[PDB]
Structure formats: structure tokens, C-alpha cells
Amino acid sequence: HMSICTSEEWQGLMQFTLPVRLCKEIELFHFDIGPFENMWPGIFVYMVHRSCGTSCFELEKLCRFIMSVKKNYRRVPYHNWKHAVTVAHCMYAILQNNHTLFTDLERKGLLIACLCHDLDHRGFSNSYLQKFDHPLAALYSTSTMEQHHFSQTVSILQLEGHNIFSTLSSSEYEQVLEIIRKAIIATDLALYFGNRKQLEEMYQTGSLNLNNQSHRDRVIGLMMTACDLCSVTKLWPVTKLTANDIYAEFWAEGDEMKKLGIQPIPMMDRDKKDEVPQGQLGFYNAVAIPCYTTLTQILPPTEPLLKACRDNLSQWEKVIRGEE
Ligand SMILES: Cc1cc(C)n2nc(CC(=O)N3c4nc5ccccc5n4C[C@@H]3C)nc2n1
Numbered sequence: 541h542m543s544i545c546t547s548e549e550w551q552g553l554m555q556f557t558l559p560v561r562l563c564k565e566i567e568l569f570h571f572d573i574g575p576f577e578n579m580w581p582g583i584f585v586y587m588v589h590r591s592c593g594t595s596c597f598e599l600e601k602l603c604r605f606i607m608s609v610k611k612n613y614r615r616v617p618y619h620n621w622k623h624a625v626t627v628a629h630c631m632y633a634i635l636q637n638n639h640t641l642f643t644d645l646e647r648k649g650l651l652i653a654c655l656c657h658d659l660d661h662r663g664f665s666n667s668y669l670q671k672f673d674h675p676l677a678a679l680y681s682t683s684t685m686e687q688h689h690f691s692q693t694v695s696i697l698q699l700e701g702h703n704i705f706s707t708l709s710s711s712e713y714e715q716v717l718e719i720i721r722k723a724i725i726a727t728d729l730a731l732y733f734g735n736r737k738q739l740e741e742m743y744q745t746g747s748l749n750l751n752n753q754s755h756r757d758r759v760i761g762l763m764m765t766a767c768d769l770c771s772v773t774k775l776w777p778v779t780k781l782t783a784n785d786i787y788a789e790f791w792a793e794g795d796e797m798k799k800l801g802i803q804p805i806p807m808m809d810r811d812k813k814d815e816v817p818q819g820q821l822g823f824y825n826a827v828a829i830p831c832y833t834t835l836t837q838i839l840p841p842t843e844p845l846l847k848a849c850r851d852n853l854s855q856w857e858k859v860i861r862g863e864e
């Protein structure tokens with residue numbers, strides 16, 4: 541039930557080289573993958589190679605892997621291929637700027653997990669599938685989509701000629717898969733609030749210890765979250781755009797509820813469009829800013845994300861006060 545790429549696709553990938561002019565910009569946090577759709581898979585490989593060295597993975601098995609992932613993203617307005625790459629990029633920037641805080645095994649795991657984190661998203665929220673009464677919530681009933689996303693990854697990983705991790709030891713294999721699982725589950729926004737509070741705590745009392753694996757997992761998790769929301773960290777006109785994308789889904793979900801004579805929350809109601817800027821404000825203020833603030837504290841080199849967030853915040857304020 542997994543979908544595979546054709547030899548044409550993956551072989552195309554292998555032959556791609558990145559234009560020299562992007563080499564610089566790719567290293568920047570606010571870098572936008574938007575205007576380079578064909579290059580997306582190629583851009584992932586590049587990031588893999590630079591982070592983890594050129595022969596970290598048998599290039600052949602890697603390219604098949606990436607194109608198959610692509611094919612299992614659906615054609616929805618936001619939780620799509622583009623999202624997966626954008627998020628994976630953001631993690632690349634994070635890893636790059638903290639290069640020795642993490643292991644080869646973490647960096648392989650995390651870029652992979654990012655690319656895989658929303659695999660086979662249907663544009664329906666966790667709340668929806670549970671609240672009426674999908675076969676998926678009938679299988680995992682906390683963090684529904686996220687457990688599916690991980691299962692999907694594993695399925696793709698177990699496909700013929702696709703196993704990029706094959707040449708690890710079986711102990712290392714079972715570790716990276718662990719890393720990944722925790723990383724993906726962490727993107728359930730429900731878990732983030734608990735997780736950031738815990739971190740907030742540990743940092744403030746100076747009991748945060750990157751040698752303690754449990755702490756490691758929470759710092760990783762926060763990263764995953766930071767990466768997931770990173771649209772808010774692009775330059776205003778990019779962010780503005782990405783917003784319409786996230787809303788299109790929300791309102792498609794809202795519509796599907798209205799069809800069962802159920803009133804959607806205002807966020808998912810396209811008849812409540814003018815409330816949007818305000819909603820951003822709220823989201824930036826209760827979610828985004830706290831996310832990046834805590835990340836910047838733990839990982840000072842990730843400060844530019846926070847800075848870009850704040851700039852977008854005040855653009856939303858300017859929109860509300862009516863100056864855009
Ligand atoms: C990446 C990402 C992920 C998520 C879940 N959101 N959610 C938001 C917006 C949001 O949370 N709000 C929001 N917008 C609204 C728009 C209209 C009406 C009510 C609205 N409300 C209520 C609430 C304050 N922006 C996000 N961006």
C-alpha cells in the first residue's frame with residue numbers, strides 16, 4: 541500500500557547538481573525553498589551530503605528513498621511535499637549551526653524524520669479524525685497522524701532497495717529508528733506545550749543536561765517543533781503566502797464539518813476570514829514566540845529564527861492596526 545518511485549525519477553535525482561548561487565543562501569535560516577520546486581529533492585540530498593558527508597548513504601539507495609517519500613505526500617494545500625522539505629531545511633540550518641552538539645546518528649535520523657514527519661497527511665487534523673470517527677483514530681488514539689506518519693516511514697524504509705540504514709549495526713539501526721519515532725511524535729503540537737514548559741524549567745534552574753538522554757529527547761523535540769512552524773520565520777511576503785496555505789486546509793476541514801451540520805471553530809471557518817490576522821497574533825504569541833524563545837536560550841546559534849519570528853509578529857500587528 542506504499543507508493544514507489546520509478547527508476548527515471550531516482551536516476552534523475554542522482555545527476556542533479558545545485559546551482560552555485562544557492563550554496564550560500566541555503567545556509568541561511570530564512571532561506572525560502574519556494575521558487576525552486578524541481579530542485580527540492582536535489583536540495584535535500586545536498587543538505588544530507590553537507591551535514592553527514594558525501595558517502596554517509598549509498599547515493600543510489602538514498603535517491604530512491606527521497607523520491608518514494610515524495611510520492612507518498614498528498615496534493616493538499618499545506619501538509620505537502622513542500623512542507624516536508626521546508627521543515628527538513630530548517631533542521632539542516634539548526635544542525636549546521638550547532639555542529640558538535642549532536643551525533644552522526646542524530647543528524648541522519650533528524651533530517652530523515654523531518655522529511656518524513658507529515659507523510660501521507662490528508663489535511664485533516666488529529667481532532668477531526670478522532671471527533672468523527674475515522675478508521676485511523678480507531679488504531680492510534682493519541683497523536684493519531686503522527687503514529688501513522690512514523691509507520692509510513694518504516695514501511696518505506698522496508699521497501700525493496702530503499703533501506704538507507706541497512707549498513708548500520710543492528711544496535712545503531714534500532715537507535716536511529718528510535719530517534720526518528722520520538723522526533724515525529726514530537727510534531728504533534730499537543731505535546732509541545734508540556735515539552736517547552738519542562739525545558740523552560742530545566743534551563744532556568746540549570747538542571748538541563750544534554751548527556752541525559754531524556755533531556756536530549758526534549759531538546760530534539762523542541763527542535764522538531766521549531767522546524768515544523770518555521771514558515772513564521774521566513775521573510776514577510778513568503779510568510780504571508782504560507783498563511784493562505786495553512787488556512788486553505790483549515791477551511792477545507794471546516795467545510796467538511798459544515799456538511800455534517802456541525803459548526804467549525806472560527807479558525808476553520810472561511811466565513812470568519814477577517815479574524816485571520818488576529819489569529820496569527822494569538823498563535824505567534826501563545827505558540828511561536830515561546831517555541832523560538834526557549835530554543836534560542838538552549839541553542840543560542842538559533843537566535844535568527846526568533847528574530848525573524850518577531851519581525852513577522854509586528855507585520856501582523858501592522859495588519860491589524862490597518863497598515864498593510
Ligand atoms: C503553523 C500553524 C499551526 C497552527 C495550528 N496555526 N494556527 C494558527 C492560527 C491560530 O492558532 N488561531 C487562529 N487563526 C484564526 C483565523 C481565523 C479565526 C480564528 C483563528 N484562530 C484561533 C487561533 C488563535 N496559525 C497557525 N500556524
Ligand SMILES: [Mg+2]
Nearest residue numbers: 657658685727
Ligand atoms: Mg504533523
Ligand SMILES: [Zn+2]
Nearest residue numbers: 657658727768
Ligand atoms: Zn508538520
